[PDB]
Ligand binder design. Sequence first.
Ligand code: SF4
Ligand code: SF4
Lengths: 532, 530
Amino acid sequence: DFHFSAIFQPTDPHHHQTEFAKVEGSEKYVEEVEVFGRQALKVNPEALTILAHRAFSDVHHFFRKDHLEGWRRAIEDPEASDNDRYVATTLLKNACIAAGRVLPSCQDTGTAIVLGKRGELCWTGGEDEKYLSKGIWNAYRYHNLRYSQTAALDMFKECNTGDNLPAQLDLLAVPGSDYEFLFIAKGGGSANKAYLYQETKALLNPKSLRAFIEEKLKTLGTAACPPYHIALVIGGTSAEMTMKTVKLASCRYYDSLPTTGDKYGRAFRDPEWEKIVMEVAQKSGIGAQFGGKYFAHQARVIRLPRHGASCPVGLAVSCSADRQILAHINKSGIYIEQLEQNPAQYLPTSVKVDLKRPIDKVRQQLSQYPVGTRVMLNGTLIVAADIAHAKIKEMMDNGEPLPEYMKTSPIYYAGPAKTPEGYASGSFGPTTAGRMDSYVDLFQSHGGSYITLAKGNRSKQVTDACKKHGGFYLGSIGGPAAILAKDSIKQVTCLAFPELGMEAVWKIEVEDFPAFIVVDDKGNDMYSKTLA
Amino acid sequence: DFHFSAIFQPTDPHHHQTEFAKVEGSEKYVEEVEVFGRQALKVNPEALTILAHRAFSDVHHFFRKDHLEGWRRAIEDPEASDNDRYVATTLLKNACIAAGRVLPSCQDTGTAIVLGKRGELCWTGGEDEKYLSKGIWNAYRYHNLRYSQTAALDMFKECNTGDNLPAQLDLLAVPGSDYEFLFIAKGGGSANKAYLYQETKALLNPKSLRAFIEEKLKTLGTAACPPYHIALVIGGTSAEMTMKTVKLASCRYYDSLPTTGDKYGRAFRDPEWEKIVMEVAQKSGIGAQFGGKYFAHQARVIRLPRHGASCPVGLAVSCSADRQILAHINKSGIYIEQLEQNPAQYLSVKVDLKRPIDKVRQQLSQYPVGTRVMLNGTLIVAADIAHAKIKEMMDNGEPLPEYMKTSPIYYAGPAKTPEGYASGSFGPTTAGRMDSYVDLFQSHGGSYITLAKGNRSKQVTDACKKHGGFYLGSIGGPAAILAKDSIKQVTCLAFPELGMEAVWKIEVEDFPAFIVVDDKGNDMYSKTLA
Ligand code: SF4
Ligand code: SF4
């Protein structure tokens, strides 16, 4: 006989385990009515604007307790490495700055994602996408965030949209008369560490699956600012469903699923395999960015049904800029998840490098030290990320020289958020280094980019380039954009390509800017053992 | 100033370009009403059951014109190879048999996927998932389809659900008072050829993008029964959004998008790059399964906005079992897309298996790869779970079973047998998924001859050379004509609890195949899919 079984059967579908705050007076936006014997809720669509505006403000200044507790664990665990403790302390101090509500926790204020669940009898007037987008627009326009969206005018010609739109608006039709939401401000670096694998039944045994996990976790590297919330989804009804599920799992949205399967194919969380993922992450030695135990805060593993011919697998992370917030609109008004507004309660050796010297003397100083050495940088950085590198390569392909401004100072891969009134800099942490790997040998062959500063492990071509050309790659801590702006970045000026907005080439002056020597001029790489 | 711009701005959002038939009497399930001054629609949820049942019945017996036209093009084009024409003719003849409404076009009757768009003022009572699922359950239970869904009792212990549930039910909240749908019966093999790449700005130039397309298309191989509808999505707001978009593009759901971008980041189809994809597909020589020009029916390329730090890319195909139906419910009733009910308007070495296997191997050794053969005799049928169970038995010290040593191994899983028929639809599954077993099984005295579809990895070529084996490629997709004309007896041999994934013993006549891998290190795909 027919038995309907929903794939997802959370025991807490409305997220009662989360603490919510009411938006004061917001009952004025809703009215209970009855039509054809059924209870319905009229919702003024301005409620959607108000809610999205608050969500995409709050999430940039505060974190959940589970995330903060993870950093505290990395500080207090005797098994944490010294670098684990240093990185987690830096990230907690960054969170304390961000809680001042001026500087966002990361310069990459993300793509705005809305998962909405509109009841059959929740009546908004139907212009939900426009009103949510207006709230998002307000959040990014009137706060010190960043416009991160790139429009395609044609296949290759691009421009920044200038407002962090469009958003990803996934509005679902569900039972009832309420409107439920998950808002995510998703960083690009962690979005890029969402991977889909097309596997088979041959994977589905303990030995094969553990070996697969060990291999795939290393491909995350440190490129998305660990400690990570790691999510792994085994199975699914389509690739897109697997990838949606792994995103939501990384946001802890599926924490209340059953922990056993059944003959109807329901989804389940698998605590045994979560523990295995954590053991693999800890034993990998990758650590909280620079070697140790704290590659991961926690793990979520969701097993899904599959077509017999298929086994899609999703792997994804939430990075240090772990930013999501639940909300709902009901007969009592607008409710939004309460994040931790006092992160300070979770709080309990270097070589000084003067960059205000000829770059060849800086190279000479760095050559004295092994990979893993912590340095403190003082002086000028030239800032250039993806679009600037591509434009400069295009100029060189058309016969122009590498610009002189690429030869005078170390190159910092970064893109700043907007500058608060009275501040020298907005949040201004590093970009993922690996995306620039194809340029390093070329630029060094033309006399520049001998020292680069960014975050994440890099490919072998960069290690080889630095050995051939007497170069270095310095790893900033990834994620602490607010404390870097507040304490280290003293002056920012636009140097080239002003038309590119935040993706222009900048000239910045820094003090006490921490980094580790990741790649030296001798063929060595701090990550060569843990990310072999 | 603020300007809202939806990412997707089709000029034909309601699919007016599609022809629909109304389900007779279905106005009884709907009532137009007015609530607080706006137009609304009451829908009896039984309409959802009726609609899903009809959609997931019709789609297994009929195709769209764009798909059928592609097979005709492959036959009529002087530049098509002989193998292109042979494969396209076989697939058209298969479609003619499926249009008899008894045998489905493919044994893999797919995962049931529903994209639904429920208007704000379309009121069903809210139990939409249950009522849609009942209609799907009805379609798979009361017709000669297949139960393809595998439930996980724990991480590794699995069972077939026995009813082709659960479905993928993606129900969206949209403006208005109607209910619009795309139903997809998605085969596993083409589902597996949905790929996500995480790229960078360094890809976004003509030379790099062309080279990327040329490399990634080859990774599709023939493993999802081409000619393909190829979809490519460049950009997206997340990996899952890129992958949803490439799925929908492959279903021609986004055909009416704009063809230029703007400063607000709207999605667009890119005809220039569609033409480039088609040029790459034709020049690859991969062909309609066995070399030629007809790797692809057509291409869809959608360019999306992206976060400056990100460039997700999706690549996906619709296979020979190209199965989707549009539908809508409105104040007049239930409307369902009309597919082509008259596909007919669009129109070797004999190998006796009734011998010791060593004699069959000796005969096959006389011929080069690319030779077309006709098989007559017993095939032993075993796919993914059966292979895993047999490996496990051997790892625990048990023999390779006798039934892996007597006959060619056909990798397949049958659909249900119609009353009065010898066999349900019964075409091949993708060979590559069994590659990890070939050397092992041959080392232990069996699986010397395998029969399936798709190009295989180098380990299989090496195994067949080391052990004196062969891989035979059936045409991929023509499951109904194979069942009607070639399969004479079917018996479950082992592991009956696995449903369609049991081991079967079948007796066949006139079963066509090509020698893809021989016993000498040669592979029919080595030039085109190196
Ligand atoms: S820089 Fe790091 S913390 Fe910020 S969004 Fe990118 S991956 Fe996340
Ligand atoms: S066997 Fe071929 S035609 Fe049938 S669903 Fe699989 S890929 Fe598609």
